[PDB]
Amino acid sequence: MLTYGAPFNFPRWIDEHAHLLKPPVGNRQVWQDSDFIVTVVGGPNHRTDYHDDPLEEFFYQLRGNAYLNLWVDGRRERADLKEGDIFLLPPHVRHSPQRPEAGSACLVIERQRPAGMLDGFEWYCDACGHLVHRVEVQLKSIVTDLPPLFESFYASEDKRRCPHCGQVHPGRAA
Amino acid sequence: MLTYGAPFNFPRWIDEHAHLLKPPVGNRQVWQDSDFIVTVVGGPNHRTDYHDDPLEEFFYQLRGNAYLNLWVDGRRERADLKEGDIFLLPPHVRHSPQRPEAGSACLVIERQRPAGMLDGFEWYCDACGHLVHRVEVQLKSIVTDLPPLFESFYASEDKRRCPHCGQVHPGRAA
Ligand SMILES: [Cl-]
Ligand SMILES: [Cl-]
Ligand SMILES: [Fe+2]
Ligand SMILES: [Fe+2]
Ligand SMILES: [Fe+2]
Ligand SMILES: [Fe+2]
Structure with missing residues (x-):
């Protein structure tokens, strides 16, 4: 079966979940119990934590602008996610997403982590x-x-x- | 390091690879040697083979329209990928993508298969x-x-x- 349902219009879905793409919720996962974790992340949201993901993370900044504070080569750096940018983050690069804009929307794709990872x-x-x-x-x-x-x-x-x-x-x- | 490079504008990238998003090539993988296999698939292309993918496949039909011929519940079925549709295909659902339109462009995301799968x-x-x-x-x-x-x-x-x-x-x- 199509466990995850039929295809559907993504922009309309983003519009209809606008109330969740802002504080306090900020994001919304598209499908449940899938191997691919597919999330839309809104704004505004700033944070101080850095994430060490043992697997890759894919970004497509659909609406608005954001940026990732990074540690690369032992230095603090920034990768800007301008509207329309895509980006693939390698495993373990420390990143702290900053999402200053309301009405922004980023497609973020990750993988379920197996036990022990x-x-x-x-x-x-x-x-x-x-x-x-x-x-x-x-x-x-x-x-x-x-x-x-x-x-x-x-x-x-x-x-x-x-x-x-x-x-x-x-x-x-x- | 940012093994896969910095963020970049996806629509511009699709424009600049237009010559590859048509026969005989038809598609182009965005990053090499990544765990996430990220491909843009153009058109036109019709095919008769069905794919049995041991892992999930994510689709976002960015430009133009396509459709997947499927086997679900033992019947032939079709899932339409209209412009703007997203879709997550569960493992092993037999699918045969049909991409009748020139200038069409679909983001397709898959995972590297481990040895033995x-x-x-x-x-x-x-x-x-x-x-x-x-x-x-x-x-x-x-x-x-x-x-x-x-x-x-x-x-x-x-x-x-x-x-x-x-x-x-x-x-x-x-
Ligand atoms: Cl994020
Ligand atoms: Cl395809
Ligand atoms: Fe992360
Ligand atoms: Fe200190
Ligand atoms: Fe496939
Ligand atoms: Fe026959």
Whole structure:
């Protein structure tokens, strides 16, 4: 059977989920229980966490503009996702998506992670650039597996304290 | 490093590869040596083979219209990929993409198959619907692994002969 239903018009679907493509929800997965995790991500949303994905991530910025803060070659860098850009991110490149625009919409495609292949989420010190904290997770459902993780970082000065310079990371907002 | 390069404008890329999005080439893979196989498929192209993909296939018909001839629930069916449609095909659903329109362009996303996970390509009898022939392949490079397969079916009345009714399948054109 067509487990995932018939084809359907993507722009209309994005329009009809506009109320979810903004805070507090911000994104919406298109199909459930698939190997390909296909998500539309709206805005605005800024964040301070860096994602260490053990597999590739595909981006197609359909509407509006965004950017990825990255660590590449040991430096902080930015990759801009201008409206109409596509991009393939290699495994493990640390990235922190920033989505300043309301009404923006990005197609993001990932793979289900097999058991034992963990995702990393980490924060870096704004003063000295040292790793402040890292949590690894077996990512099964982002709705339940990720928000508490971020919440526990914001709530702990211990977790936010830079082991190098002692600066306490701001937490939720940069 | 950004192994797969920086983000870039997808519509412009499609425009600049127009000469490849038509016969005899018809398609073009966006990045090489990636886990995600990301292809843009043009037209026109009709075909008689059905693909048995051991993993999912994602479609986003960016420009123009196409359709997939399918076998679902034991019947011949069609899924239309109208301009703007997206679609996720479950593993193993037999499909034969038909792309009648020049200037059309479909984003197709697949996964590298691990060793031992084979793709099937098969043809069905127009008279009685029985399986006429099936080849399984370890799909590594579609440029070298698939054209000879189709070529050997067209060249063999033996391969094209229906074991049920004896009808010799037409081969290349329906
Ligand atoms: Cl994102
Ligand atoms: Cl196709
Ligand atoms: Fe990510
Ligand atoms: Fe620090
Ligand atoms: Fe296929
Ligand atoms: Fe037959």
